[PDB]
Amino acid sequence: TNPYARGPNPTAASLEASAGPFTVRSFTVSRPSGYGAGTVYYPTNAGGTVGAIAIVPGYTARQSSIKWWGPRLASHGFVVITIDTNSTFDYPSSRSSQQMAALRQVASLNGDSSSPIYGKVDTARMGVMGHSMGGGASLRSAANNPSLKAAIPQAPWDSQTNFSSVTVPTLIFACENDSIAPVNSHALPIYDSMSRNAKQFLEINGGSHSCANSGNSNQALIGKKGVAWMKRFMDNDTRYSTFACENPNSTAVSDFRTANCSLE
């Protein structure tokens, strides 16, 4: 039996719903260390320790742009920290350092008797997500920290596209009509550079640059795939292998690619 498995057996409906089975609470980090601000979302009743995920917004953006992931993931059994960066003008490398600092503070708070997440986190199981320059940050975090269990960059942007050293299971969300981080020069080549990992590419049909941000019209599909990816790879939960590795068969998807994804 998988010591990391949490929650009931998944269905398409359970993954497409606004919330998973678990009750979610949140709090603001009092003295953020290494980043600007943070909100921690956590399940109150997960039935065991859970992995943690740090999410970074893009340039000139704030927590609001990515915060829909907080409740969506936490309600399926993850601790999620959404952050503001030291400056909204920070570039990917700086964003990556702050993303890892956010994971470190979640791990420290796990050992803080006064924190709401005291003893709730399996601090060996961590993941990274982020939008555009925060997606580049997540890729840098994965390349520099191979012990990370999963990475989900959305509409990624960086000054380079070669992330060939990444061995972390990486799911890239791309927005077909993105004019800020065009898929042909960003998301697609970044996806194609990784030959050493489980990976996936899901492009949203007709999507603009913000197609996976808070308020998007595809939270059923995007949330299904993000939660399934984190379940399969952060929890080793093979109940989610089909949901994580399959073509979703959606008219909202204009391009789907995947490699080294079990599907068993």
Q: Which of 76, 209, 210, 235 is catalytic?
A: 209
d(CA 135, CA 166): 14
* Residue 181 contacts residue 132 (beta carbons within 8 Å): yes
The encoded tokens of residue 202 equal 């899901």
To the query of whether residue 237 is one of the catalytic residues in this protein, the response is no
Report the sign of the C-alpha dihedral through residues 31, 35, 171, 127, in that order. negative
* Residue 175 contacts residue 135 (beta carbons within 8 Å): no
To the query of whether residue 178 is one of the catalytic residues in this protein, the response is yes
Q: Is 15 exposed, middle or buried (0-12, 13-18, 19+ CB in 10 A)?
A: buried
Q: Which of 96, 132, 141, 210 is catalytic?
A: 132
Resolution in A: 1.6
d(CA 222, CA 215): 12
Radius of gyration from C-alpha coordinates of the chain? 16
* Residue 86 contacts residue 36 (beta carbons within 8 Å): yes
Which experimental method was this entry solved with?
Answer: X-ray
To the query of whether residue 76 is one of the catalytic residues in this protein, the response is no
d(CA 196, CA 102): 26
Amino acid at 91: Y
User: Within 10 Å of residue 250's Cβ, how many Cβ atoms?
Assistant: 16
